């Protein structure tokens, strides 16, 4: 990751040199065997240069690593795919496509993998601008480095500008102030600047939806807000299945049982459920190798279901019942139907 | 309830006269049938006088309604039963029996039914002083009617003097003050008064354990504090079985499944699950009678598990994750072992 073509040439070079210095003696030269251990060594000692150069790429999430969220899926489809995959209909009914959407909800509940998912379904380039980058632009006073981000999105159209943790600055000056940060204002400028053409969609997501600039939520700007709640039983069974994908997991485990026992568990909590179960399988496998090599020389093939019990004893529901209470207060603040239901005639 | 012998005579009198005014015509006189409907009418129309006179009585909880709480059960046995059922050993080792203990923890987690249970093993008269009584004594400035309560405990010995909601007053003057309430001080006086004999045990319980008078927690006074946590899986399956006792519940309902689904649920919420399941059975059975009588004339024998789904959809985990957090912060405020573990020699 972060490897340009010259970096890949350096990778192959150092791997071939590890094969050379592993053979280490002319016919033996032609029988050199560049094995995957050499590539892993070279990859562990490759110094890449292409990091900090943000990558545009159609990501691989395929909409079922993030299960559930059916109405959220429908809103994201009708906001991203329909403008770009059926654009004749929009110019027929005169609707300008919405310039962007604003996720909000509990931290680490599948908000980043929910814009990667829609970028994959739309087959659009995905540009994640994490909170540290906005913070860096707020501290170096380099509020003109976000013009470059939007220009990169414009060239990489169709795009998904996932402004991850849009409220990083508002947390960074939580308190003489009041609104309108240095670079959030620039995001507003070059967000109102581009037309509804070019199919660039900003999906800036906020953990805290109230501290943000209220000028963001104006129409034309990130007007649609989408609550991203905690995983439902389908959503968190898909989260457990995705986190345990590529992991050798036993057949006797019931991931639906886990997903049924975990109610208030955020998506990140369900990762640390599986990354403490993988960690316990690591401990048991390595300990088994140690007690084998010291005695019988002189296996834990899979994460057994008692590892999903020892790991699940350390199950920390990270998002409280009062954080999500405030997010639902914001949600009902955003719901003002109030009697225009059964508007008949 | 609240019926003295004269009130019971009035109850039988009005029930017999309801039988008389139901017959409503000399041999028919001797054939009067005082049926349970007459007694239920008499109860619905009986004015009792013995209310507000607090009843001393060995309660009926038998430690199986309050399941789990095994270490708390051991502490309560060691604090109540051992002073009274094995008093020779205490005078042998010179230990004075503790005058009082103080429960604390989340509201409605089985604290009242946890002093009734130990009063039931002790076969001691149980005297519950609810929070409104302490508040009433704090507002009328009649702080000398708690001498009467302790005197009634002295005559009704052995006792479990459950000063329920001991921090009612501290909540009622949240804030010029600081400690040492009007009648909390009198409870301290009459608690320091009686000797460790007479076997009167004060088990006053607080929802909020920090706002209480810190002079209460001095040794000699309610020095032992016992954390009453949210129900464990055994505890809440016993709670669900106890709340559903005397109610016709199905066989195919899985109460251990309910107790396994519900983690943060306090005991009161587990009652309201059953009192919304019984209420839904009421609705369905009454609607059955209604559309039978209006059509078939011109049954829901048990609470089916589809009522324990629709009722349990309205499941409110009433105690937050930040309330029990503060109770645990107070709990290891109360644990300062700190390196004197493994004190060997």
UniProtKB/Swiss-Prot annotation, chains A, B:
Kindly provide the PTM information from the record.
Phosphorylated by tyrosine kinases in response to T-cell antigen receptor activation. Phosphorylated in mitotic cells.
Q: What binding partners and quaternary form does the record give? A: Homohexamer. Forms a ring-shaped particle of 12.5 nm diameter, that displays 6-fold radial symmetry. Part of a ternary complex containing STX5A, NSFL1C and VCP. NSFL1C forms a homotrimer that binds to one end of a VCP homohexamer. The complex binds to membranes enriched in phosphatidylethanolamine-containing lipids and promotes Golgi membrane fusion. Binds to a heterodimer of NPLOC4 and UFD1, binding to this heterodimer inhibits Golgi-membrane fusion. Interaction with VCIP135 leads to dissociation of the complex via ATP hydrolysis by VCP.
Tell me the outcome of changing residue 165 to Q.
Does not inhibit interaction with RHBDD1. Increased interaction with CAV1 and UBXN6. Impaired autophagic function. Defect in ubiquitin-dependent protein degradation by the proteasome
Linked pathology is: Inclusion body myopathy with early-onset Paget disease with or without frontotemporal dementia 1: An autosomal dominant disease characterized by disabling muscle weakness clinically resembling to limb girdle muscular dystrophy, osteolytic bone lesions consistent with Paget disease, and premature frontotemporal dementia. Clinical features show incomplete penetrance. Frontotemporal dementia and/or amyotrophic lateral sclerosis 6: A neurodegenerative disorder characterized by frontotemporal dementia and/or amyotrophic lateral sclerosis in affected individuals. There is high intrafamilial variation. Frontotemporal dementia (FTD) is characterized by frontal and temporal lobe atrophy associated with neuronal loss, gliosis, and dementia. Patients exhibit progressive changes in social, behavioral, and/or language function.
Lineage start:
Eukaryota, Metazoa, Chordata, Craniata, Vertebrata
User: N6-acetyllysine (modified residue): where?
Assistant: 89, 92, 251, 326
Question: Where are the N6-succinyllysine residues found in this chain?
Answer: 251
Describe the family membership recorded for this protein in Swiss-Prot or TrEMBL.
Belongs to the AAA ATPase family.
Which residues does this entry mark as bearing Phosphoserine? 49, 285, 342
User: What is the stated purpose of this protein?
Assistant: Necessary for the fragmentation of Golgi stacks during mitosis and for their reassembly after mitosis. Involved in the formation of the transitional endoplasmic reticulum (tER). The transfer of membranes from the endoplasmic reticulum to the Golgi apparatus occurs via 50-70 nm transition vesicles which derive from part-rough, part-smooth transitional elements of the endoplasmic reticulum (tER). Vesicle budding from the tER is an ATP-dependent process.
| Source species of the chain | Homo sapiens
- The stretch of the full-length protein covered here is 404 to 773 of 806
Gene name of this polypeptide: VCP
| Compartments, as annotated in UniProt | Cytoplasm, Cytosol; Endoplasmic reticulum; Nucleus; Cytoplasm, Stress granule
Query: Under which name does UniProt file this protein?
Result: Transitional endoplasmic reticulum ATPase
Q: Which residues does ATP 2 bind?
A: 108-113
Its domain description in UniProt is:
The PIM (PUB-interaction motif) motif mediates interaction with the PUB domain of RNF31.
């Amino acid at each position: 990751h972060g490897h340009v073509g010259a970096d890949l040439a350096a990778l192959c070079s150092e791997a071939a040199l590890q094969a050379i210095r592993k053979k280490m003696d002319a016919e033996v030269m032609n029988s050199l065997a560049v094995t995957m251990d050499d590539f892993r060594w070279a990859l562990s000692q490759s110094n890449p240069s292409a990091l900090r150069e943000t990558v545009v790429e159609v990501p691989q999430v395929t909409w079922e690593d993030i299960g559930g969220l059916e109405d959220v899926k429908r809103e994201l489809q009708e906001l991203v795919q329909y403008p770009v995959e059926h654009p004749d209909k929009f110019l027929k009914f005169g609707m300008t496509p919405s310039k962007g959407v604003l996720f909000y909800g509990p931290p680490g509940c599948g908000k980043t993998l929910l814009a990667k998912a829609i970028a994959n379904e739309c087959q659009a380039n995905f540009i994640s601008i994490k909170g540290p980058e906005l913070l860096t632009m707020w501290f170096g006073e380099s509020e003109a480095n976000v013009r470059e981000i939007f220009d990169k999105a414009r060239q990489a159209a169709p795009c998904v500008l996932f402004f991850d943790e849009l409220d990083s600055i508002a947390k960074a000056r939580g308190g003489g102030g009041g609104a309108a940060d240095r670079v959030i204002n620039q995001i507003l400028t070059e967000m109102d600047g581009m037309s509804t053409k070019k199919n660039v969609f900003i999906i800036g997501a906020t953990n805290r939806p109230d501290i943000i600039d209220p000028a963001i939520l104006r129409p034309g700007r990130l007007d649609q807000l989408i609550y991203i709640p905690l995983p439902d039983e389908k959503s968190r069974v898909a989260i457990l299945k995705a986190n345990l994908r590529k992991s050798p997991v036993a057949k006797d485990v019931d991931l639906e049982f886990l997903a049924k026992m975990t109610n208030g568990f955020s998506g990140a909590d369900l990762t640390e459920i599986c990354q403490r179960a993988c960690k316990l399988a690591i401990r048991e496998s390595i300990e088994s190798e140690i007690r084998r090599e010291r005695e019988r020389q002189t296996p834990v093939p899979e994460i057994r279901r008692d590892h999903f019990e020892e790991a699940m004893r350390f199950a920390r529901r990270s998002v409280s019942d009062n954080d999500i209470r405030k997010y639902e207060m914001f949600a009902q603040t955003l719901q003002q139907s109030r009697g225009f239901g059964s508007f008949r005639f």
